[PDB]
Amino acid sequence: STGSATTTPIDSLDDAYITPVQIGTPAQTLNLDFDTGSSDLWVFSSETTASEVDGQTIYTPSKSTTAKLLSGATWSISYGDGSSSSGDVYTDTVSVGGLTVTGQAVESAKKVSSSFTEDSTIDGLLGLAFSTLNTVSPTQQKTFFDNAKASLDSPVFTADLGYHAPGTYNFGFIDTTAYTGSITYTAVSTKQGFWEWTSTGYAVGSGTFKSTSIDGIADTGTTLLYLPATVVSAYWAQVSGAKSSSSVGGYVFPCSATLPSFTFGVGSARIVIPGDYIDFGPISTGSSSCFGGIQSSAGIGINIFGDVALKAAFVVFNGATTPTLGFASK
Ligand SMILES: O=C(CCC1CCCC1)N1CCNCC1
Ligand SMILES: O=C(CCC1CCCC1)N1CCNCC1
């Protein structure tokens, strides 16, 4: 089997991408944030505290003929941005792009933090990191990808995010029309449960490539590119007037600037992030200070190749017995 679904930016900045997901019988379609950096599938629901719902579409398990309470199971997640959600668990039929999993754990939120309430476009998350990070207790649950894997034509999914445009998530096949040149594969450690790999270095604009090992996670759930402070300083030093602002919480730059590209290594291959991808616009409406799309990972504990980096590539998440990542230019 295979599946193919379009993923769409939630706003003009590509702050997050949503993908339609069918849950239950008859189908209830929710727009979920696919997250290669976490391993829970959780939704706004008929159980979510009413004051914490503001415009999201909710899953109502009592309207699904295939929904079953997973008796005794609860979940609770705390994200790095300080947001959180928690609740109970149903099993139900879940389909993504025509690929159907029966018996998927659907984590129904009873509580969500303010960042989730305030984002009316995101009805929940769908996790695609390894199932070892799933938060369901007392019986950990599998991700949609892990449940689908045995049925798939190939044990892979691919992320092809757009810059200010829709893109695609495919399951079970590699669309050889969706990239240019060849795919470079690189090793993945599952030791922390993330898709964790090691970039071979970087360049800023037309500068020389610096060979240096950079360990991080391929995370579709993350908007920006988080790298070591040395690398980030080297990038922003090439932008007149850029500075790190403790008031704003990262690097900002004059909205009049033209940003240089950023290149990251994948083995002997190179992925080039165009400068425009690194512009996240005014810090507040009407400001002439703009927020940078490359930020320091100092205080995170890990480098994050988020959407700014991933959207410059066709990315293969190879879930074979020995997992690997693949990157191609596009
Ligand atoms: O990119 C982030 C936060 C990144 C943080 C960096 C360190 C911990 C996580 N998003 C995506 C859009 N929704 C809000 C959260
Ligand atoms: O903060 C995290 C990890 C969340 C935890 C990992 C396992 C349990 C939840 N991020 C940054 C945003 N994208 C997802 C990865």
CATH code of 296's domain: 2.40.70.10
Buried b (16+ CB within 10 A) or exposed e, 296-317: bbeeeeebbbbbbbbbbbbbbb
Q: Residues in the chain, how many? A: 330
Quote the ligand 1 centre to 85 CA distance (angstroms). 15
Among residues 60, 37, 43, 57, which one has the least CA distance to residue 112? 43
DSSP state, residue 54: S
Which structural technique was applied? X-ray
CB atoms within 10 A of CB 286: 6
One domain, residues 231 and 144: no
Q: How many CB atoms lie within 10 A of CB 211?
A: 9
Q: Which domain range does residue 254 map to? A: 175-330
- Longest Cα–Cα distance of the chain, Å, equals 60
Say whether 311 sits in a helix, a strand or coil: coil
Q: Which of 79, 219, 227 to mutate to test the pocket of ligand 1 (most atoms within 8 A of CB)?
A: 79
Omega before 26 within 30 of 0, i.e. cis: yes
Q: Can you tell me whether residue 208 is helix, strand or coil?
A: coil
Give SS3 for 212: strand
* 138 in the same domain as 10: yes
Q: How many domains does the chain have?
A: 2
What distance in Å separates the CA atoms of residue 74 and residue 139, rounded to the nearest whole number?
9
Cβ atoms < 10 Å from Cβ of 246: 6
Q: Please enumerate, as own/partner, the contacts of 59-63 that have beta carbons within 8 Å and a separation of 24 or more.
A: 59/23, 59/24, 59/28, 59/30, 59/106, 59/108, 59/123, 59/124, 60/28, 61/24, 61/90, 61/92, 61/106, 61/108, 63/24, 63/26, 63/28
Which two three-digit tokens encode residue 1? 């089997």
| Residue 123 CB–ligand 2 contact under 6 Å | no
- Whether 297 is catalytic is no
127 close to ligand 2 (CB < 6 Angstrom): no
Which ligand approaches the C-alpha of residue 81 most closely? 1
Query: In one letter, which amino acid is 37?
Result: G
Beta strand 41-43 with 99-112 is: parallel
Pairing of strands 84-96, 68-78: antiparallel
Take residue 158 and report the two structure tokens written for it: 């691919």
- The closest-lying atom of ligand 2 relative to the alpha carbon of residue 219 is 13
Q: Rounded to an integer, what distance in angstroms lies between the CA atom of residue 93 and that of residue 78?
A: 26
Cis peptide before 138 (omega within 30 of 0): yes
Q: Indicate if 198 and 294 belong to the same structural domain.
A: yes
Alpha-helix runs per DSSP H in the chain: 114-118, 144-148, 229-236, 307-310
Of 174, 198, 214, which residue constitutes the final position of a domain?
174
Q: Which amino acid is at 168?
A: T
- Dihedral sign from CA coordinates of 260, 261, 267, 268: negative
76 DSSP β-pair partners: 86
Element holding 225 (H helix, E strand): strand 225-227
Ligand nearest to the CA of 118: 1
Which residues form ligand 1's pocket by a CB distance below 6 Å?
Answer: 15-16, 80-81, 115, 222-224, 300
Same domain? 31 vs 124 = yes
Whether 219 is in the pocket of ligand 2, judged by its Cβ within 6 Å, is: yes
Q: What is the resolution of this structure in A?
A: 1.0
Examine the domain organization and report whether 164 and 274 are in the same domain: no
Separation of alpha carbons 150 and 164, rounded Å: 34
Query: For atom 10 of ligand 1, which residue has the closest CA?
Result: 222
Of 258, 298, 248, 264, residue with least CA distance to 278: 258
d(CA 37, CA 302): 12
Domain boundary among 108, 143, 174: 174
Active-site pick, 14, 35, 40, 307:
35
Pairing of strands 41-43, 68-78: unpaired
Nearest CA to ligand 1 atom 13: 16
* Active-site annotation holder among 199, 261, 296, 297: 199
Cα–Cα distance between 74 and 41 in angstroms, integer? Answer: 13
Is residue 115 within 6 Å of ligand 2 at its C-beta?
no
Q: Which two tokens stand for residue 295?
A: 């930020």
Minimum-distance ligand 1 atom for the alpha carbon of 16: 12
Contact 312, 180 (CB under 8 A): no
Q: How far apart are CA 222 and CA 300, in angstroms?
A: 12
Ligand index nearest the alpha carbon of residue 223: 1
Query: Based on the domain organization, do 19 and 151 belong to the same domain?
Result: yes
DSSP, collapsed to helix, strand or coil, labels residue 187 as strand
Measure the CA–CA gap between 157 and 223, rounded to whole angstroms: 20
* Alpha-carbon gap, residue 43 to 23, rounded angstroms: 10
Spatial separation of the C-alpha atoms in residues 151 and 92, rounded to whole Å: 17
35 touches ligand 2 (CB under 6 Å): yes
H or E stretch at 101: strand 99-112
What is the rounded (10 degree) CA torsion for 311, 279, 262, 270?
10
262-266, strands of its sheet edge to edge: 269-273, 262-266, 196-204, 210-218, 303-305, 225-227, 294-296
Is there a single domain that holds both residue 184 and residue 323? yes
Side chain identity, residue 228: P
Is 199 assigned a catalytic role? Answer: yes
- Is the CB of 79 within 6 Å of ligand 2? yes
Q: Are 161 and 21 members of one domain?
A: yes
